[PDB]
Design a protein around this nucleic acid. Structure first.
Length: 50
DNA sequence: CACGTACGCGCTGTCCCCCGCGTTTTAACCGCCAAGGGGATTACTCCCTAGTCTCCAGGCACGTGTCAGATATATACATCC
């Protein structure tokens, strides 16, 4: 979730390189995967159509 | 104003129950889904109903005459000394 407090807490960190380790990248819809790829690298990847 | 006595108040005992502290538990709090309904707005359409107007008539208020029940005498029969 991009709205949660953990998302804004970790997204405000001054880290050069990030990595996400999970088993299920997409669970409900493509908006969640959009949130993960926005947390990874913010802006060259956009998802706006469901 | 006088009297007198009952009760407010001060003192003492006593016991009991609440407070302080330490220890253990536990649920409030914060952060999370998971979808779905409730409700606040914005815009639009429609139609029923309440305001407005005119006219009229009877309900309410006032006044007054009467009328039936309650109260107070007028006279006659029964009764005590």
């Amino acid at each position: 979730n991009a709205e949660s407090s953990l998302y804004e807490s970790l997204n405000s960190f001054k880290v050069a390189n990030r990595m996400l380790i999970t088993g299920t990248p997409l669970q409900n819809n493509i908006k969640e995967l959009a949130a993960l790829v926005n947390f990874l690298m913010p802006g060259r990847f956009t998802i706006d159509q469901e």
